[PDB]
Design a binder for these strands. Structure first.
Ligand code: FME
Ligand code: MG
Ligand code: MG
Ligand code: MG
Ligand code: MG
Ligand code: MG
Ligand code: MG
Ligand code: MG
Ligand code: MG
Ligand code: MG
Ligand code: MG
Ligand code: MG
Length: 47
RNA sequence: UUGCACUACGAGUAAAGAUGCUCGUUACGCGCGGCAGGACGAAAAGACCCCGGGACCUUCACUACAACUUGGUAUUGAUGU
């Protein structure tokens, strides 16, 4: 699943860049901790 | 229990062991008490045996299945080597 992240994650990206991740790292670690959101409209709220 | 009935015996004969058929012999009609030789006595659609069917049991008979177990894949991520 692809994510527009909000914090800084080592080995994954800086703020705001969209990146696809292995779908268990998304819903278990980056989404409950608030470090990312989905990529459906935030690319327009980043651009 | 019961097809009948004024239901003898001998030698025969016959589905090959006869109250009932042949040839003889014997026996007045009807009861009561006893005995248990026959009526292949009664009872039980022979348990034996065989044929057909069934059931349960056995196992290195056949096919399955539970259980137990093997790997892949999903749940399932991150980082070094
Ligand atoms: C033999 O096993 C025996 C014979 C019966 S005699 C008519 N049966 C026993 O049950
Ligand atoms: Mg997945
Ligand atoms: Mg005779
Ligand atoms: Mg005679
Ligand atoms: Mg006569
Ligand atoms: Mg007489
Ligand atoms: Mg008498
Ligand atoms: Mg007798
Ligand atoms: Mg009898
Ligand atoms: Mg019989
Ligand atoms: Mg397994
Ligand atoms: Mg498995």
């Amino acid at each position: 699943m692809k994510l527009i992240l909000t914090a800084d994650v080592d080995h994954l990206g800086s703020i705001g860049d969209t990146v696809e991740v292995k779908d268990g790292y998304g819903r278990n670690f980056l989404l409950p901790r608030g470090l990312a959101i989905v990529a459906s409209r935030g690319a327009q709220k980043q651009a």
